[PDB]
Amino acid sequence: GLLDGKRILVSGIITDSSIAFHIARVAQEQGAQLVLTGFRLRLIQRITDRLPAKAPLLELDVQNEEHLASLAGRVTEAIGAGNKLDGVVHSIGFMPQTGMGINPFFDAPYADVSKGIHISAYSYASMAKALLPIMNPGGSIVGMDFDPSRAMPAYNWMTVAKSALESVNRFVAREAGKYGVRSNLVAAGPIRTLAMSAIVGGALGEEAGAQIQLLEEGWDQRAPIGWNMKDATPVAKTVCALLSDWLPATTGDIIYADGGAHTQLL
Amino acid sequence: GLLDGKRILVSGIITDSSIAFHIARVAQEQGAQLVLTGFRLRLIQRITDRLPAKAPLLELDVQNEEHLASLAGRVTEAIGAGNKLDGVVHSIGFMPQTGMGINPFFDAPYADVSKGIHISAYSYASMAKALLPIMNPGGSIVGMDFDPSRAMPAYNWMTVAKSALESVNRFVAREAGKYGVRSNLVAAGPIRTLAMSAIVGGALGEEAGAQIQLLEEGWDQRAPIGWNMKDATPVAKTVCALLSDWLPATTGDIIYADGGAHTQLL
Amino acid sequence: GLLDGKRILVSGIITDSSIAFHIARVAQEQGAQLVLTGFRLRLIQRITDRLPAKAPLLELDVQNEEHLASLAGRVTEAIGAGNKLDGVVHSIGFMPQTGMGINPFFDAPYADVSKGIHISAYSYASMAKALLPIMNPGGSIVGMDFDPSRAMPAYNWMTVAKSALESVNRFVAREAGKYGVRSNLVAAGPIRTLAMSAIVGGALGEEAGAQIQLLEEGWDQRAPIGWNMKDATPVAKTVCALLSDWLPATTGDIIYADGGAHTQLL
Amino acid sequence: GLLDGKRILVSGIITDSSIAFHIARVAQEQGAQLVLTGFRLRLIQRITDRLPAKAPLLELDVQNEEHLASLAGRVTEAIGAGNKLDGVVHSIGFMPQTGMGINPFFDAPYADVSKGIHISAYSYASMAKALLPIMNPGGSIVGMDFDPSRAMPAYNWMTVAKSALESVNRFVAREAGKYGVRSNLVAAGPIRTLAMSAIVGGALGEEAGAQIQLLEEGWDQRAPIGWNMKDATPVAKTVCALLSDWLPATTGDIIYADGGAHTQLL
Numbered sequence A, B, C, D: 001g002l003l004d005g006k007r008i009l010v011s012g013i014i015t016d017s018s019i020a021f022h023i024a025r026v027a028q029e030q031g032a033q034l035v036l037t038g039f040r041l042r043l044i045q046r047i048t049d050r051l052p053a054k055a056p057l058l059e060l061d062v063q064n065e066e067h068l069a070s071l072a073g074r075v076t077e078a079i080g081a082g083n084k085l086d087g088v089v090h091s092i093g094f095m096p097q098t099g100m101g102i103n104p105f106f107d108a109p110y111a112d113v114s115k116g117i118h119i120s121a122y123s124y125a126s127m128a129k130a131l132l133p134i135m136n137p138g139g140s141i142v143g144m145d146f147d148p149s150r151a152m153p154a155y156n157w158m159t160v161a162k163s164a165l166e167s168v169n170r171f172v173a174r175e176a177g178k179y180g181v182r183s184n185l186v187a188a189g190p191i192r193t194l195a196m197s198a199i200v201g202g203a204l205g206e207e208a209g210a211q212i213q214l215l216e217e218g219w220d221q222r223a224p225i226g227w228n229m230k231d232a233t234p235v236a237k238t239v240c241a242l243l244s245d246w247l248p249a250t251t252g253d254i255i256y257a258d259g260g261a262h263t264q265l266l
Ligand SMILES: NC(=O)c1ccc[n+]([C@@H]2O[C@H](COP(=O)([O-])OP(=O)(O)OC[C@H]3O[C@@H](n4cnc5c(N)ncnc54)[C@H](O)[C@@H]3O)[C@@H](O)[C@H]2O)c1
Pocket: A011, A012, A013, A014, A015, A017, A018, A019, A020, A038, A039, A060, A061, A062, A063, A090, A091, A092, A093, A094, A119, A144, A145, A146, A187, A188, A189, A190, A191, A192, A193, A195, A196
């Protein structure tokens, strides 16, 4: 058991195709006791019933100030007073279709970009602010990322939200360090979630479906060890490695679980 | 004359200590014909009267949708129909004191961070969207930046705004390339503007004044050729080099005018 | 047992203060079966006698073409016919004092620089060439590194050799990927080995000694979680995480075990 | 005249297709007074005869310690006693075909790799060591580079030598800064020199020829402003901008003259 006895909060489960669902499943397989958060709760309760073990499901809208202000208290009620968190998983991402997809880069209104940056980047800090007081020293906060160091088609303002998230992670590390807590991001390669498969199937047109297929083919080609977009397990394992006590001198950083694709040009 | 005959729009002049004032002064010394934009216009008209040559001053609030929608037309009226821009200088930056300065990183409300990101990063794209239709092929768009790849004290959410601006610049390059136009950022070292000198004088307390002095001393120490925070000229010259035809195969990039400080650990 | 059942070759043990000694000790505490290499085998035998468990000790001078030609055969005789290695640890670094220390950067003769790059950078590829034919799919090659992205005092040509090692690692990942094997480096913060503590005491003079002390002190300050030069365990555990099956999608990459110092400016 | 009155040493001219030839031609078109070096001086004399203006041609084999010892004295005899250089251009790269091309990465003997790093990386420092005592404050040393941050087919050990050159540049900046001199590299996209066009035609085989063609074709596609392998002028102008007084605060750095390709994923 890699995470034996650890109490880990896991956000971002929407379906059993979510990266967070696999992070939760692998953490439970490694002995961690989970607390799950979710923004449609009826679907969430049905989805999480497919996890190896039972886990309390708390409601969390990262834009709702009341949900965040009460979060530490609601978590303590779920795990019991006298207990604290050893880990936190931020697997939350959102960008309206005006800022991500087929809409031209310049045509995204700032109100939609601002909402995307609030959920995808600012929420990493507001979740750390809420949960650090109830975290044990030696704990770990892990956020999900997708390498934004180079521009690419369709991802557009979500790439901008990820460049902001990377900057936020380095400042969250400064704050988290005071609690003896690490803060890191996992830059994952593309994973065929329900929305990603729908895009490949033509939900966003044949040009967006071709650009995503080209990105996926190129990812597997550049990755020295290959990249299977239908397998979320290598990413979930990497998040568990950062949640464990086996990367204890790593903080404010990014671990690439992308098959090594970002290290190769061709 | 490095910029002989070129028509360059220059935003961001507030006082004669502004980086944009020195960019405008050096561009005029190199033969460029300027169009200046400004967000308190009475002070601006008095300040720009100290420039080597006359230049029309247009009003531009980057958050005002009407100011941006009319900008290309207002610029054409200032330089004359039949004429286009060869360059655009974005020297605009803002972050309320809740997100930059002495306020703790986690205590910045999202509304203030969102406003800071709108002016400091999103506006680089909205200015490029407005001005690219009236730009000549071979033109150049230059934005001002401050290396955000590593976290630091006090700069806090403005560092996050700069990481977002760097990502925006790479997408603006994709769009600008269609017009044969380059888009680059200049990452400058610290420059003693009126606000920066006030901070060193204790406007933000003795701890912020010590952290800024430590940053400035360390910048000059790490810079192999030294760094004079009271001299804006090396930065203004670098912006002019990118505006010229002497860096024609460089776009989506960052040029460091920081004395080389970012290339040295100590 | 994090590395239960795994056969791991560990090079670089010279004294009980070497990072390789701590890597070997933690790898054995986690159930791995080791093969040790040495370049003085009688004195290395006494050092490796202090490890929790016994392990076959093979002679390997990375500059000796014959030692590398026979290496795979000598490893198979030590681990059993039909068996393969699951992990390889390169913890070998060398730079004559003409290229590292108080000697001016320009005063390093190329013959010394060449020997330093041969042992520190080329040997990573020649060890992978000799051991990849005898490694299992899912295997892991880990090399030791220090961040050379920014120049610094005294390290001089050792930094250049580390920049070369980073590039070699990315090409070793291309080759290793054909075998299902990962190749990664661990960029550690400064560790007080027998030589580093002597250099601080005055072995290289008061000016270089002050520069090294200032350089090493800045690590603890920049690191959000702190940094203890006297504790090699956080570095050793990070190596064992890369050798395990918990980072299965990371190759051609660098993991920073530096307390997060490289992510902070000050 | 961008370089009017400046004395600039230019190494690396072999044929009229060399980047050094175009750098020398553009430098002379901009008013600079040149000093050329060569390693075959009678055949280089005929090539340099095609430049706009005459220039003294000195012999320089970067591996010859005697050529480097006498270099400063031979440059002063050519430019006049009391005079100093304002610029130095290192455009020298070499890697035996065992370390670059179709030979497997692991099959490169170290003797060949060592010679390649000596000419491509070490020679940048040994040229700066010999010429810094005879350079003016405000001077500029420019080396030629290709982006080696990501591995790629065929370039193999030449990429490793470029990673080493990037590190050497940052240390040469520390030393050069003591003289008021800058040191920078220009990372160019692929340029069709006599060798590159022969490799595409089939000199290295159909598999490597296809890989090189695919690699070089991806540059034009990724570059927001496009990329013409047959045009060396954009690279030559970028070098002249670094040699001028228009980038006076940039040192230890890399300027990318690659059409912005390195800033885009696809
Ligand atoms: N799927 C990929 O290809 C991929 C690759 C790299 C990184 N990522 C990142 O991994 C993370 C997980 O995304 P995913 O791919 O599993 O997709 P997903 O569809 O499962 O969505 C992630 C979650 O974000 C939640 N969320 C959205 N708005 C929220 C709000 N206001 N409050 C709370 N939660 C909110 C959703 O409910 C969902 O559960 C995201 O940060 C994503 O950007 C995804």
